[PDB]
Design a protein around this ligand. Structure first.
Ligand code: MG
Ligand code: MG
Length: 342
DNA sequence: CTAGGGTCCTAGGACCC
DNA sequence: GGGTCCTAGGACCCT
């Protein structure tokens, strides 16, 4: 009863797309991200920039101190979405069991596939080659018996490579695997785990489930399971979006309600346009707002509401502005909608 | 020197039984 | 006191 799971992942996705479309950017350091004047961060960088230490989520000021010649690009999201739709259609030629996790990556369940003599390794290789043909973008892949190992594997022969983990290899792989490599174990969790002497899956294997449950709740069960190769999550091809959000960080903190109100007047049309692509009648479950202060605390207040309404969002923001700001400056304003359930 | 797009989990009181 | 809704906050994911 062993499944075959592929995780396909595009290499330097946004940057790879800008390089294809402009060959002049191929061996100079580039990154998609907001300027230092806009208080931005790096979305991603190409390998010539990564050589300097440039990483996704790095503050752009830090990026430029490591890499003074970094060329900064704003991003063409329609071009990324187009490449995303194309690779998902390529995925569909092999199976319908496709769970996309973002623009540039998907799980594929090829257990019941008849392609490539049932070889998941050859399927992943054909997919990567087909993506390179047709799109001139490279992809890496991971092959494993469960989702999370397949996703760890797609990183290990990046870029333009793949890695296969058979059931026989699972125990040696896990023994030395850092817990931080499991998707969903982030910096806070890894630091708590490290401070009790837990660094690898091998360490967690020597742990009692009951202790993990008390110390981390349902997360402790996940930790215990994953540390043993256990991951029964099914590839799910019918997930649907649940929310729509539009927010902006200002170049300077704002201190007057008039400034906050002006920002909302520009955010609202964008929220309406994006909601309308998926809900023409603008009917929704909740709507709300978000402020982030200069002490980097953030607050949201949202409520049941039947249909996108600009004035109520202004009204709510006013109340949040008056009631939870406490004299701090504001660096971000956001609008938010929760979608109806079906 | 700290984005913008999201998902999922937790937790207290309201409400219902 | 157990479900379930409402709401707020936070860790985490992707580029
Ligand atoms: Mg990628
Ligand atoms: Mg990815």
């Amino acid at each position: 009863g062993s499944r075959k799971i592929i995780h396909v992942d595009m290499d330097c996705f946004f940057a790879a797309v800008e390089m294809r479309d402009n060959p002049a950017l191929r061996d100079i350091p580039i990154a998609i991200g907001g300027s230092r004047e806009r208080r931005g961060v790096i979305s991603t960088a190409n390998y010539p920039a990564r050589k300097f230490g440039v990483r996704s989520a790095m503050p752009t000021g830090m990026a430029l101190k490591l890499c003074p010649h970094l060329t900064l690009l704003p991003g063409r999201f329609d071009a990324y979405k187009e490449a995303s739709n194309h690779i998902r259609e390529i995925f569909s030629r092999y199976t319908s069991r496709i769970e996309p996790l973002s623009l540039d990556e998907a799980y594929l369940d090829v257990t019941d596939s008849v392609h490539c003599h049932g070889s998941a390794t050859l399927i992943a290789q054909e997919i990567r080659q087909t993506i390179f043909n047709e799109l001139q973008l490279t992809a890496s892949a991971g092959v494993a018996p469960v989702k999370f190992l397949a996703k760890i594997a797609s990183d290990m022969n990046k870029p333009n490579g793949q890695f296969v983990i058979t059931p026989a290899e699972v125990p040696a792989f896990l023994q030395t695997l850092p817990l931080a490599k499991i998707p969903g174990v982030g910096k806070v969790s890894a630091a708590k785990l490290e401070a009790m002497g837990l660094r690898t899956c091998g360490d967690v294997q020597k742990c009692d489930l009951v202790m993990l449950l008390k110390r981390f709740g349902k997360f402790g069960r996940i930790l215990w399971e994953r540390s043993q190769g256990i991951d029964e999550r099914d590839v799910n091809s019918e997930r649907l979006r649940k929310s729509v959000g539009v927010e902006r960080t200002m170049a300077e903190d704002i201190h007057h309600w008039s400034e906050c109100e002006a920002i909302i007047e520009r955010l609202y049309p964008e929220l309406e346009r994006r909601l309308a692509k998926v809900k023409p009648d603008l009917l929704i479950a909740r709507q709300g707002v978000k402020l982030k202060f200069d002490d980097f605390q953030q607050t949201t207040q949202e409520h049941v509401w039947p249909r996108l309404n600009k004035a109520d969002l202004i009204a709510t923001a006013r109340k949040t502005w008056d009631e939870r700001r406490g004299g701090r400056g504001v660096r971000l304003v956001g609008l938010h909608v929760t979608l109806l359930d079906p």
